Amino acid sequence: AAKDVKFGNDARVKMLRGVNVLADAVKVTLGPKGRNVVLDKSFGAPTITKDGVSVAREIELEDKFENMGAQMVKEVASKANDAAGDGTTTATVLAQAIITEGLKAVAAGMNPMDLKRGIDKAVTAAVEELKALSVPCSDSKAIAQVGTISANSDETVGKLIAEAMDKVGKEGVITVEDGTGLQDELDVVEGMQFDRGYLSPYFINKPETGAVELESPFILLADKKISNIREMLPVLEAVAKAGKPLLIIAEDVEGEALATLVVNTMRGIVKVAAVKAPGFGDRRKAMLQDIATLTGGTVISEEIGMELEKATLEDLGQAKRVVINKDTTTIIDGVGEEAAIQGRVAQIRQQIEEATSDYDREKLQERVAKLAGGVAVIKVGAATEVEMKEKKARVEAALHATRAAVEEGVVAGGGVALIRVASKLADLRGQNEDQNVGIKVALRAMEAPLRQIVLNCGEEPSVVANTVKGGDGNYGYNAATEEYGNMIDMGILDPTKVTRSALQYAASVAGLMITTECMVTDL
């Protein structure tokens, strides 16, 4: 229809305003100081949102332009959020600062391209500085602190993460489940996880994560790849009597032949999942055997000459629940046999010793390791179910961040790294003045989030920022202490990766936002 066209700033302004609104809520929330926001819902009782991301998620802008601008930030932020596990807000905060300055520059009329380049250049420099700055992750006490940061002053989460982490081991994977009751429960789980993808996203379950969880899944394992439906079918027929959800393990399915027929021909209404059998070769078979024992189901192979058709439901094992993600597919708990599982482990363990070769040992050890498979399950209790879900989500985020953080190693929190890097960054100059300003802008952007925390403190961020900058080495302000001390000594460290991730995304967002000469919209 008729279009309303605006040029120049008009495009920017809408985005800017939208960004600010979203940013403002997020910024306040960010930092242990800040607090959450509330949203209405037509669907049901209104939703109250905490966590910076959630607040942003909740916030929608009536104005299309503003909303769209807001959306852009959010999407980037989420992406950073996923990878970092934390720092969603930080990216948002950074982006807002960058955008505003960039917009002003746009007002300046300096070509934004240089600025973007300068910003990117600055970002790269900052990243390098950060990496150098980053140091190894500290001990569990630090870990708890790391957890707390993700916690946003959720002491329990950090404690839980640390506790879970300790028992499982940092390396060991920890899984989160909804709490049985208000009190959290930490249980080591009997079961194994193997890294296998889901064949198709179609398989991917309802939840947003896209990990598929099956309730009481049935496990059919074929050492042989499941070439075609027909072999499968007689298994399926038993499955019809079944209907507890079916998980299928096959060495491989050729996508075209199976998928084409299956998808088009077959509705595939019945719940099914497919995963490639872990490992390859004998090891794969061995892994299958291990899985089979754990499942308590049996595996059918051509070599055995057992027929899939022949195999009944009984052959198929059952799992209490299975979760699958693209990276990995896990079975939370195969029913298994306690004796059987143990026996297999011992047998494998014996094998590990038996094999002279390291390689043989490794495969066996890996196999046993999986079978022993101490997976941590963490239950989060809550006063209410809703709370539990909220808590659980937070916990999960924290866990990821913590795990990443430990490996990456700690960097000073409080945006100390950001401020510190900026000073170094400032010296660096862009190719051209326009770039230079952008570079400066980026530096300014980095500084801001420190200020925000200070603002939450109510201390004047200027002094703090100045002081922070002045201090060499790792210098920072601890909100809780409200005292100056080494970040490391304080033990409050934000993950390198999260910081880096957020910054990069934020920078990207800002750059993208800046360059629009013109907008068109409908009237």
Which residues line the annotated binding site for ATP?
Answer: 29-32, 50, 86-90, 414, 478-480, 494
Which range binds Mg ion by CB under 5 A, 54-62, 83-91, 413-421, 446-454?
83-91
What x/- string results for residues 268 through 307 when contact with ligand ATP is judged by CB under 6 A?
Answer: ----------------------------------------
Q: Which residues contact 356 (CB under 8 A, 6 or more apart)?
A: none
For residue 320, the 8-state DSSP code is S
Q: Which of 326, 351, 343, 231 lies closest to 292 in space, CA to CA?
A: 343
Q: After which residues does the chain break, using C–N > 2.5 Å?
A: none
Find the binder of ligand ATP among 58, 86, 333, 408 (CB under 6 A).
Answer: 86
Tell me, rounded to whole angstroms, the distance of Cα 105 from its chain centroid: 34
From the list ligand ATP, Mg ion, its own copies, none, pick the one residue 60 interacts with, judged by a Cβ distance below 5 to 8 Å according to partner type.
its own copies
Does 447 contact Mg ion by CB under 5 A? no
From the list its own copies, ligand ATP, Mg ion, none, pick the one residue 32 interacts with, judged by a Cβ distance below 5 to 8 Å according to partner type.
ligand ATP
Token reading at 371: 């079978």
Long-range contacts of 303-311 (CB under 8 A, 24+ apart): 303/223, 307/231, 307/234, 308/220, 308/222, 308/226, 308/231, 308/232, 308/234, 308/235, 309/231, 309/233, 309/234, 309/235, 310/234, 311/220, 311/234, 311/235
Find the binder of ligand ATP among 67, 90, 496, 501 (CB under 6 A).
Answer: 90
Q: How far apart are CA 459 and CA 107, in angstroms?
A: 31
Shortest Å distance, C-beta 72 to its own copies: 7
From the list its own copies, ligand ATP, Mg ion, none, pick the one residue 453 interacts with, judged by a Cβ distance below 5 to 8 Å according to partner type.
ligand ATP
Q: How far apart are CA 248 and CA 237, in angstroms?
A: 14
Q: How far apart are CA 381 and CA 379, in angstroms?
A: 6
From the list its own copies, ligand ATP, Mg ion, none, pick the one residue 413 interacts with, judged by a Cβ distance below 5 to 8 Å according to partner type.
ligand ATP
Q: 18 vs 373, which CB is nearer to its own copies?
A: 18
Which range binds ligand ATP by CB under 6 A, 231-239, 253-261, 350-358, 410-418?
410-418
Backbone angles phi, psi at 379, to 5 degrees: -105, 135
- Chain positions 377 to 396 lying near ligand ATP, rule: CB under 6 A, are none
Q: How far apart are CA 140 and CA 109, in angstroms?
A: 51
Find the binder of ligand ATP among 18, 69, 87, 334 (CB under 6 A).
Answer: 87
User: Contact at 8 Å (CB) between 95 and 76?
Assistant: yes
Q: 102 vs 415, which CB is nearer to ligand ATP?
A: 415
Does 174 contact ligand ATP by CB under 6 A? no
Binding residues with Mg ion: total (CB under 5 A): 1
- Find residue 186's DSSP bridge partners: 378
Q: How far apart are CA 474 and CA 95, in angstroms?
A: 24
Q: Pairing state of beta strands 48-49 and 37-38?
A: antiparallel
User: Contact at 8 Å (CB) between 291 and 194?
Assistant: yes
Q: Which of 316, 276, 310 lies closest to 296 in space, CA to CA?
A: 316
Q: Which residues make up each annotated binding site?
A: 29-32, 50, 86-90, 414, 478-480, 494
User: Contact at 8 Å (CB) between 164 and 186?
Assistant: yes
Find the binder of ligand ATP among 16, 76, 122, 453 (CB under 6 A).
Answer: 453
Shortest Å distance, C-beta 97 to its own copies: 21
Which range binds ligand ATP by CB under 6 A, 158-166, 247-255, 474-482, 510-518?
474-482
Shortest Å distance, C-beta 89 to ligand ATP: 3
| β-sheet with 185-189: strand ranges across | 174-178, 375-380, 185-189
Q: 84 vs 341, which CB is nearer to ligand ATP?
A: 84
Residue number with the smallest Cβ distance to Mg ion: 86
Q: Which of 134, 81, 119 lies closest to 422 in space, CA to CA?
A: 119
Find the binder of ligand ATP among 478, 496, 501, 504 (CB under 6 A).
Answer: 478
Token reading at 401: 């961040």
From the list Mg ion, ligand ATP, its own copies, none, pick the one residue 53 interacts with, judged by a Cβ distance below 5 to 8 Å according to partner type.
ligand ATP
Find the binder of Mg ion among 58, 66, 86, 390 (CB under 5 A).
Answer: 86
Find the binder of ligand ATP among 19, 49, 52, 217 (CB under 6 A).
Answer: 52
Does 415 contact ligand ATP by CB under 6 A? yes
Token reading at 330: 């896990």
Find the binder of ligand ATP among 72, 299, 380, 479 (CB under 6 A).
Answer: 479
Does 474 contact ligand ATP by CB under 6 A? no
Q: Is 222 helix (H, G, I), strand (E, B) or coil?
A: strand
Q: Is 195 helix (H, G, I), strand (E, B) or coil?
A: coil
- Find residue 176's DSSP bridge partners: 378
Does 32 contact ligand ATP by CB under 6 A? yes
Residue linked to tokens 């990276």: 327
List residues binding its own copies (CB under 8 A). Answer: 1-5, 11, 21, 25, 28, 35-40, 42, 45-46, 48, 58-65, 68, 71-72, 75, 111-113, 215-216, 241-244, 255-257, 260-261, 264, 318, 383, 508, 512, 515-523
Q: How far apart are CA 430 and CA 439, in angstroms?
A: 7
Binding site for ligand ATP (CB under 6 A): 30-32, 51-53, 81, 86-90, 149, 152, 413-415, 453, 478-480, 492, 494
